Structure 1
Amino acid sequence: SAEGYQYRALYDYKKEREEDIDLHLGDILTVNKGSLVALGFSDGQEARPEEIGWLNGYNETTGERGDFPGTYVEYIGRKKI
């Protein structure tokens, strides 16, 4: 997709698995809209990452991509990617 949902990390997270990424307070993540379409959460639940569970996206702040817990982040809006 040409669109991304944006999140900001509210807490630090140390990666627990190879596919995970580290989060640091204030990091900004972009989840491709296609990812949430695929999971069935694109009909509004993008704004409730704590209800989705694990997310996969790009940490714009660190340049790393991978899985991170949705309860650790806040939805901040969407952008073109």
Structure 2
Amino acid sequence: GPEGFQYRALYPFRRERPEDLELLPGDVLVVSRAALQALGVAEGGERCPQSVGWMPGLNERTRQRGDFPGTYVEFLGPVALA
């Protein structure tokens, strides 16, 4: 199976915590399967980010990593990683 998943931010998120990840609408985020497994997301729950809650991820526009709310993003599908 796929090493990761892509999401697209739909709504701006301003960092609240040191480890938060800033979002602007249209930002593509990559989340690794290892990271969802590690949070105990059950197989295929990646398709409902509103249910995962907060996720760690790479924001491709900023190049930063950190935590962001799944309710601010839509699932795009599976990807290869760097």
TM-score normalized by structure 2?
0.92
In the alignment, the residues of structure 2 paired with residue 64 and residue 14 of structure 1 have an alpha-carbon distance, to the nearest angstrom, of 14
Q: What are the ranges of 5 or more consecutive residues in structure 1 without an aligned counterpart? A: none
List, as ranges, runs of 4+ consecutive aligned residues in structure 1 with deviation greater than 4 Å.
none
How far residue 76 of structure 1 moved from its aligned partner, in angstroms, is 0.1
Q: Which of the two has greater strand per residue?
A: 1
Q: Residues 19-67 of structure 1: CA distance to partner in whole angstroms, max 9, x if unpaired?
A: 0011000000000110111122251110101001101000011101000
Distance 1:64 1:53 in 2: 19
In structure 2, what is the Cα distance between the partners aligned to 1:40 and 1:54? 12
Aligned residue pairs: how many? Answer: 80
Distance between the aligned counterparts of 2:67 and 2:51, measured in 1? Answer: 15
Question: What does 1:1-81 align with in structure 2 at a 5 Å threshold?
Answer: 3-81=3-81
**Identical amino acids, percent of aligned pairs:** 51
The alignment's C-alpha RMSD in Å is 1.1
